[PDB]
């Protein structure tokens, strides 16, 4: 955009004034040598050449002052401006004053190279502006040489200059910005995996202890990493002896819930259950869940604590008081009754969609039971509680009215496109540096020498094989078979890749040392004019960034030099002395340039590298905890969720089952240690229902969750819209279909198991519910109506192996086609006598 | 943390969890591992074997179908007395116990009907523990290692026995194998190293306890079929040993009874060509062996899909040289079978 693009100069400016800063240096090291060659070697009869050189350096160490004002920072384009046209105007009245045949033109094409590379990359100006100051620089240089066929060779090398010039500008900075873009990403993806890592942290606790969690967020096991992204699957459980559990049921509720409009009563069962959370978070009790009328702890089940008995029971004593608080506050006729039994108890987490901390044992029963049997507004203690309680407390018999028990009350850019753009423009350049080497010949029509037409074949099939190679890889025509150029793609490595640009660099080199071998010596335009051109070819070495720095460095300063040294004694006088001198400085100058731009390149695979990593870490994490919030809470609820602050919904027509197994008790035995593998067999048939919700014809069935042996799942829930291919009330066939196939997953299940069967029973029954969620910080979505408690009825009345089903779900399911028969009448709380009907016949 | 190194000895360790059927031998094997690699009501459960199997053998004087009757009718007096014991919660073995016990199992009558005891639920240490009584009337002896290994004890519910050899752990789990205890295997199914099939091969001839009409190795052919096509034990390999080599020997020497007379497949099988039958061999009992043998690989060869394998040995619980041998070559074996993982 604008500020974008802006705020990218912003943090691509040190580089930028680092880059001026060794301009600044080079060209005050120019007027260095050249004052120093200008005083001893020639022209030590004229001062006109040294001061000029001596106060441009002055004015370059002013420079090199104004750099650190701070009238600099949005100023270095302007003053960049200001510095070339100062280089541009020197080396114009520095070359301007000769042709007195005193000074070669393979000094003056030096400082044209040089002045040319260090506007394209280094003075950091815009693309138009310093195109037309290239351009407007060479014109103006070859008309103020001048004071029909070596002119235009002179214009083809300032062509090629051009060519690799605005090559290095435009890499330079697509480089920069793209490096920029992706430290963007890699900005943004820390701060918002900080946010996706709290919200799996929020979600890990809503359903699991502190200790387990903070256990869960060290990683101390490795699979299950694995395994949120082979004979049984894995189960946490530890049978932890001495723990004291407390139920706990509202009495009255049915009433109390009486024509509440469904978002009265989720709000009102919000703050008592919050008002119970106060209470747990004070005393120390971990609560375990929270299912319909009913709440229950623990005390210290991850935790060995020594006063569990006293938590336990104070936890049932401030029940007690926030719920007579309760009834005053909010006008409502509730109490509560409270079980307490202290035992062992394995604790842990079974099933796998919907999965919850809970626990399991048969002191859980003891203490389900001694509720059951526990009066409204005492607490129903045991024996077990009791016998170490020290009986501070206002202690009764608590005898039954039909076990020692007692009651208590109180108390571009593509890093295989970079190779494409510079073999083109490389074979380029070996085009036009033939072209002019070819069209010196102004004396013969005819070229005479072989070997130069030989290595200038011989090279281009080269450059040309090449060429199609990577064109044909980039553009993919797929044209003859490429199963050879599969093959031959994979052996250009690392050092392939090094040796092929080795060559690929060299060659135009080659093709201008293809004319030494007819003599020049004698002639002096084609002495400067072949040292002139060998300049323009070692100044082409920078193109392959992607190589590295000192191999094509290396490689620049023996095929652009050493052949020279090798003709230095070839006698010629002292034009060698300042073709040293002028190899020299452009050698420093290649140096440094290709060595800052593949510092470049390595820093922009760096910063890609870096920023796909942020990447992939963040889809793990959000991945991750999404499929948490999945597991929490339904869809539509997060939807409806995510935009607000509380949750409640009043359906008007759901199906819903419950499903016991109901012979698990004798099979249980406590003998072996503990039991738990009992529980881990229970685990895996938990684990076959959650894989029958996988299945894309039981999408729109929800698990509410497991207690103990039973499965509860509930139907119409999702269906927000009626269907024009459906039906308004299929949600219920599809939910029987699921309840059918239950009873054939246990089906399965028992012909791996050995001379025992399980069985389950189920009950089905649809009517008007109301769904909501409970928690804030933690989270729980349960429904709750007369639907629900009639279908934990026609579960509890029910015959195993057979599907039960009430009166008004025979009435809809019958009229879709499936056989039913009369089972008999059913006293149900609420309904009284009912019709009952059952699915196997 | 010490979990770690907790957790890695657990990987060292070897389970070898012990299945097979009733009374196959079981727990016979695992005191033969305690005899090998590691204290007075052994003496009395030894009477109690004594005396269960002296009153099995007089109540099924009466209850053969033809009845056995007494070759000596003199001794119905002490039958009437050994019927009177028959149900009793406690008794203190009078000497008058010991003398009837002698006097009856000199009767031929009474060896007569012990001959047929394929027809009916009978312990298999009678004919020693009837010679050893004898032996030790008295209570001031000490029994032997064999009296100890011969002694039988039914096992209900999930033992276990942790021993070592050359620094290797074994850690095996004896189960019983009643088919009312069968539910409780279940819970040694995690992560076991190898399953110690365990077959008694010379009862061929007789029926379980339990419904008295199904034949024991059919029972066992059939526990076999369920517990390799299990599929919390489709990756682990069973070791399968067959019990009672010396037994299934005489039963097949004494010639009484035919096994293709109870499986008629065995009348047209040969012996395979890679039977390595032991010295001093009669070798239709080597083909009886390799019979039973192929039975139980004819199931381990009709599925398995190359995940978990069988190894079958031939075994005799209570001769602990054997037990030694197999031992070893099974020591190997399951060094190979923990490397698997
Ligand atoms: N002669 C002989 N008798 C054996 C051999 N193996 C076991 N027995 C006998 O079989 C009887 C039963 O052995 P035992 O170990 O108790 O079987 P078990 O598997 O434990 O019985 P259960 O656990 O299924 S109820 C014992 O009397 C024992 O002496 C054997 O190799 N040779
Ligand atoms: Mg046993």
Redesign the interface.
């Known amino acids: 955009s604008v500020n974008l693009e802006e705020a990218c100069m912003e943090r691509c400016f040190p580089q930028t004034q680092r880059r001026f800063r060794y301009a600044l240096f080079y060209i005050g090291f120019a007027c260095l040598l050249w004052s120093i060659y200008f005083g001893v070697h020639m022209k030590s009869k004229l001062i006109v050449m040294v001061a000029p050189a001596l106060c441009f350096l002055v004015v370059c160490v002013g420079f090199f002052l104004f750099t650190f004002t701070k009238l600099y920072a949005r100023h270095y384009v302007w003053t960049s401006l200001v510095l070339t046209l100062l280089v541009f105007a020197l080396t114009l009245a520095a070359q301007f004053q000769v042709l007195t045949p005193c000074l070669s033109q393979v000094g003056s094409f030096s400082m044209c190279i040089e002045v040319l590379f260090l506007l394209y990359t280094v003075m950091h100006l815009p693309l138009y502006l310093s195109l037309i100051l290239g351009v407007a620089y060479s014109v103006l240089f070859e008309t103020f040489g001048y004071h029909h066929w070596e002119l235009l060779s002179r214009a083809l090398l300032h062509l090629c200059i051009h060519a690799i010039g605005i090559h290095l500008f435009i890499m330079s900075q697509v480089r920069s910005r793209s490096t920029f873009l992706k430290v963007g990403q890699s900005i943004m993806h820390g701060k918002d995996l900080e946010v996706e890592k709290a919200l799996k942290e929020r979600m890990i606790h809503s359903v699991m202890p502190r200790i387990i969690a903070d256990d869960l967020m060290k990683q101390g096991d490795e699979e299950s990493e694995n395994s949120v992204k ?3 699957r894995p189960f946490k459980m530890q049978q932890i002896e001495e723990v004291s559990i407390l139920f706990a049921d509202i009495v009255g509720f049915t009433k109390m819930s009486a024509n509440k409009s469904a978002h009265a009563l989720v709000g009102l069962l919000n703050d008592l259950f919050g008002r119970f959370d106060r209470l747990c978070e004070e005393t120390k009790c971990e609560k375990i869940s929270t299912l319909g009328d009913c709440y229950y702890c623990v005390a210290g089940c991850p935790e060995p604590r020594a006063d569990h008995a006293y938590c336990c029971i104070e936890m049932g004593l401030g029940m007690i008081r926030a719920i007579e608080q309760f009834c005053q506050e909010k006008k409502e006729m509730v109490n509560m009754r409270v079980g307490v039994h202290t035992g062992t108890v394995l604790c842990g987490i079974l099933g796998m969609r919907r999965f919850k901390f809970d626990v399991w044992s048969n002191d859980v029963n003891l203490a389900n039971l001694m509720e059951q049997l526990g009066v409204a507004g005492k607490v129903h203690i045991s024996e077990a509680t009791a016998k170490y309680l020290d009986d501070r407390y206002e202690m009764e018999d608590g005898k039954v009215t039909e076990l020692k028990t007692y009651l208590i009350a109180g108390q571009f850019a593509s890093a295989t496109f970079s190779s494409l753009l510079d073999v083109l423009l490389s074979t380029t350049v070996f085009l036009i540096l033939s072209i002019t080497c070819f069209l010196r010949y102004g004396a013969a029509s005819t070229p005479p020498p072989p070997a130069a037409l030989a290595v200038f074949g011989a090279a281009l099939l080269l450059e040309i094989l090449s060429l199609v190679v990577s064109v044909r890889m980039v553009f993919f025509l797929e044209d003859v078979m490429t199963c050879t150029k599969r093959l031959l793609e994979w052996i250009a490595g690392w050092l392939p890749r090094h040796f092929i640009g080795a060559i690929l660099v060299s060659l135009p080199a080659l093709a201008v040392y293809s004319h030494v071998t007819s003599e020049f010596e004698t002639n002096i335009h084609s002495t400067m004019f072949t040292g002139s051109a060998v300049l323009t070819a070692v100044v082409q070495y920078c193109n392959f960034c992607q190589l590295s720095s000192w191999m094509r460095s290396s490689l620049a300063t023996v095929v652009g030099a050493g052949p020279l040294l090798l003709l230095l004694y070839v006698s010629a006088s002292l034009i060698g002395q300042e073709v040293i001198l002028v190899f020299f400085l452009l050698l420093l100058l290649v140096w440094f340039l290709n060595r800052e731009f593949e510092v470049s390149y390595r820093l922009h695979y760096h910063g890609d590298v870096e920023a796909d990593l942020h990447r992939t870490k963040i889809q793990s994490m959000r991945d991750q905890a999404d499929w948490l919030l999945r597991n929490i809470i339904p869809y539509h609820v997060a939807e409806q969720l995510k935009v607000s602050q509380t949750y409640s919904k009043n359906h008007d027509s759901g199906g819903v089952i419950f499903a016991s197994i109901v012979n698990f008790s004798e ?1 249980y ?1 406590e ?2 240690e503990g039991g738990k ?2 529980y ?2 229970l685990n895996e048939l938990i684990g076959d229902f959650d894989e029958l919700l996988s299945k894309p014809d039981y999408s729109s069935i929800e698990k509410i969750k497991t207690i103990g042996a039973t499965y509860m799942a509930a139907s119409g829930l999702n269906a927000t819209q009626c269907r024009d291919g459906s039906h308004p009330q299929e949600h219920l066939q599809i939910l029987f279909e699921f309840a059918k196939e239950m009873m054939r997953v246990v089906d399965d299940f028992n012909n ?5 069967n399980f069985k389950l029973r189920v009950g089905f029954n649809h009517g008007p519910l109301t769904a909501g969620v409970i928690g804030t910080t933690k989270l729980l979505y349960d429904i709750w109506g007369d639907t629900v408690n009639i279908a934990s009825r026609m579960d509890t009345t029910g015959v195993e192996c057979r599907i039960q089903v009430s009166e008004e779900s025979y009435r809809v399911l019958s009229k879709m086609g499936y056989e039913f028969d009369y089972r008999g009448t059913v006293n149900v709380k609420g309904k009284g006598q009912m019709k009952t009907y059952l699915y196997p016949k | 943390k010490q979990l770690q190194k907790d957790k890695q000895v657990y990987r060292a360790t070897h389970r070898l969890l012990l299945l097979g059927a009733g009374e196959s031998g079981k727990s016979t094997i695992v005191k033969q591992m305690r005899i090998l690699h590691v204290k007075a009501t052994k003496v009395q459960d030894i009477k109690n074997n004594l005396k269960e199997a002296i009153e099995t053998i007089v109540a099924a004087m009466s209850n053969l179908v033809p009845p056995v009757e007494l070759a000596n009718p003199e001794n119905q007096f002490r039958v009437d007395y050994i019927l009177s014991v028959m149900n009793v919660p406690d008794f203190d073995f009078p000497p008058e116990f010991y003398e009837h016990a002698k006097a009856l199992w000199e009767d031929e009558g009474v060896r007569a009907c012990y001959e047929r005891s394929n027809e009916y639920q009978l312990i298999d240490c009678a004919q020693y523990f009837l010679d050893k009584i004898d032996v030790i009337k008295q209570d001031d002896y000490v029994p032997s290692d064999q009296d100890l290994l011969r002694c039988r004890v039914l096992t209900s ?2 033992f276990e026995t942790k021993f070592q050899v050359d620094k290797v752990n074994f850690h095996m789990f004896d189960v019983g194998g009643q ?2 205890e ?9 992560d076991v190293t190898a399953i110690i099939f365990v077959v008694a091969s010379s009862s061929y001839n007789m029926v379980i306890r339990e419904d008295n009409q199904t034949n024991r190795l059919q029972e066992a052919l059939n ?1 076999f079929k ?2 390799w096509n ?7 390999s069973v070791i399968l040993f067959l019990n009672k080599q010396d037994l299934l020997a005489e039963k097949v020497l004494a010639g009484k009874s035919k096994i293709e007379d109870y499986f008629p497949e065995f009348a047209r099988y040969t012996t395979p060509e890679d039977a390595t039958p032991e010295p001093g061999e009669d070798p239709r009992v080597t083909r009886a062996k390799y019979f039973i043998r192929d039975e139980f690989l004819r199931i381990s060869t009709a599925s398995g899909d190359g995940r978990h394998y069988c190894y079958p040995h031939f075994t005799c619980a209570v001769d602990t040289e054997n037990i030694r041998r197999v031992f070893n070559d099974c020591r190997d074996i399951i060094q190979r079978m923990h490397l698997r993982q």
């Not at chain 2, 069968?182 to 995690?190: E, G, M, S, V, Y």
Request: glycine content about 2%; charged content about 25%; hydrophobic content about 45%.
């Open positions: 082979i004979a049984f099979f035995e003998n072996y593998e009992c881990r067999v791996n198991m050995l001379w025992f | 519910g999930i088919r009312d069968r539910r409780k295997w279940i819970q040694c199914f995690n526990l369920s517990i299990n599929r919390w034990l489709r990756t682990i």
